Paper text:
LysG detects the basic amino acids l-lysine, l-histidine, and l-arginine and activates gene expression of the amino acid transporter encoding gene lysE in the presence of elevated intracellular amino acid concentrations. LysG is a member of the LysR-type transcriptional regulator (LTTR) family, a large and highly conserved group of TRs ubiquitous in bacteria. LysG shows the typical features of LTTRs, a two-lobed regulatory domain linked to the DNA-binding domain by a flexible loop. Two LysG monomers are coupled by dimerization of their DNA-binding domains, forming a winged helix-turn-helix motif responsible for DNA binding.
As no structure of LysG of C. glutamicum was available, we set out to solve the structure of full-length LysG with and without basic amino acids as ligands by single-crystal X-ray crystallography to obtain a sound experimental basis for analysis of effector binding. Interestingly, all attempts to crystallize LysG in the presence of l-lysine and l-histidine failed, but diffraction datasets could be collected to solve the structure of LysG in the free form [LysG], and together with bound ligand l-arginine [LysG + Arg] at 2.52 Å and 3.00 Å, respectively. As is the case for all known LTTR structures, one monomer adopts an extended conformation, whereas the second monomer arranges in a more compact conformation. Binding of l-arginine in the extended protomer of [LysG + Arg] leads to a small but substantial tilt of helix 6 by 8° compared to the conformation in the ligand-free protomer [LysG], which enables coordination of the ligand l-arginine by amino acid residues D124 and E125 in the [LysG + Arg] structure. During size-exclusion chromatography, LysG eluted as a peak representing a molecular mass of 158 kDa. Based on the mass of 34 kDa deduced from the protein sequence, this indicates a tetrameric assembly of LysG in solution.
Author numbering:
A (entry chain A), B (entry chain B): 0 to 191, 197 to 290
């Protein structure tokens, strides 16, 4: 079995940033910190934390750290139950901009109605999102990844549909001899050539790109002719209804979405999951 | 936090039905059971279990029992998660290009024969190699450094010998009055003036340098006359045997080599070390 005192020490090293920080935080000698790490590492057979500052968990160490933060969540829920007061637990979530700007906001209502829980939303790309989940820096995440990261369970939420849209004037500007010049048409991007697959055959030259790093500004730039773009049908629907933009393409792009959460008998985590799933049921496709 | 040992004792009392049942189940005295319960109760401020039989949890005690069963499930799942992640995680080594291109590859055979083990090799100069070891970013390292870095143990692997070689034509091209113009002779380098020490006396002029950042391409450039260079005798032996290059110099340069690994009771690391030592025995000089 794994010594829970030693797990606490590893977590303290990480939370405090160094071995000395864990020493001061835990009121134990530096030798005790070192001895506890040595023992835990010898139990696992791997180095668990970097000897630099700020202290970082290794790949093997991330497992234990994630586990330690799970135990912290159980302890808080337990203390809250005995206490006779609403839990007041901070929930940290990784989410993508497209989910946050379309179907997710109804979750805010649900969380608000609880005791005094708080949300910390992190907007992350796919790779960092999974890393946050792995090391325990978030307890849940909305993601395109279907395979569960270690320590987590996965739930399918439904499918997000993107439409290829542009203003009629912009499309007409890049019509050439009755054929649309996809490569030459300025395009919108959320940040710094897959999007032309099956739209252009030969090699694609350089492309004109505008970058607008917010879901709503991204939609506004498309809406206003700065470029075409792939926009979630939820965002695009009103512009299409208003005739502000048109479909460049009858072929939608569908992206399955998943909710990944710590595997833990957590009543907060169960509750948050229900809220997210219910929102995705109401706002995503089968 | 609540002492998890005490939570186990409370859980055992309920699961076993009496204080004496928890005693035998836990291999502790009835006094030890009582001490833990009383301690847990005063930490909480509530009576947790009846001292009658069968033991019944109070309202607060039902909470801690529920929590204890949650923590038991987490502990078992964590142990299973770590075990599976360790299998997936590659052992990380820092090595220099000269070892990787000569005596090291036989290590691959040994690792391949294990379960489904993986290696991550990092090609590093001497300085970054030792820092990677120090900080825990690699578990082992091939190094010229003989003194053990903190957290690691050292083993001598043997000696690497370098030869100064060139094509016959290149040497003859820079023979003048029977004396070789070392400074004027183009040289090969692995990347961006020690190498002429004991070959030229006074201050050295400019030098003609080609850079080829691969061990094998480095050898090819020498083999093909682009410049002379210091080449591991392992690599140079075939070219010398074929008469493609010659020795510019009977003075070899010998560099003792060492294997440094983190001190950990790991059978994985022990196996890797043995494989490395054995490969070094076959491809380095005593």
């Amino acid at each position: 079995h794994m010594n829970p005192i030693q797990l606490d020490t590893l977590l303290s090293i990480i939370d405090e940033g160094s071995f000395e920080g864990a020493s001061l935080a835990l009121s134990i000698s530096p030798s005790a910190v070192s001895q506890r790490v040595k023992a835990l590492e010898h139990h696992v057979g791997r180095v668990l934390v970097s000897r630099t500052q700020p202290a970082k968990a290794t790949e093997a160490g991330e497992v234990l750290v994630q586990a330690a933060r799970k135990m912290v969540l159980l302890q808080a829920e337990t203390k809250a139950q005995l206490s006779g007061r609403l839990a007041e637990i901070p929930l940290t979530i990784a989410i993508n901009a497209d989910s946050l700007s379309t179907w997710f906001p109804p979750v805010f209502n649900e969380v608000a109605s609880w005791g005094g829980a708080t949300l910390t939303l992190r907007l992350e790309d796919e790779a960092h999102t999974l890393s946050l989940l792995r090391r325990g820096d978030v307890l849940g995440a909305v993601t395109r990844e279907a395979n569960p990261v270690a320590g987590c369970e996965v739930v399918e939420l439904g499918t997000m549909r993107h439409l290829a849209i542009a203003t009629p004037s912009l499309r007409d500007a890049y019509m050439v001899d009755g054929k649309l010049d996809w490569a030459a048409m300025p395009v919108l991007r959320f940040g710094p050539d897959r999007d032309l697959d099956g739209r252009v055959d030969g090699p694609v030259g350089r492309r004109r790109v505008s970058i607008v790093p917010s879901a709503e500004g991204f939609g506004e730039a498309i809406r206003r002719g700065l470029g075409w773009g792939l926009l979630p049908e939820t965002q695009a629907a009103p512009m299409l209804k208003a005739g502000e933009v048109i479909l460049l393409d009858e072929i939608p792009i569908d992206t399955p979405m998943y909710w990944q959460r710590w595997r833990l008998e957590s009543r907060s985590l169960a509750r948050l999951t229900d809220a997210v799933v219910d929102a995705a049921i109401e706002g995503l496709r089968p």
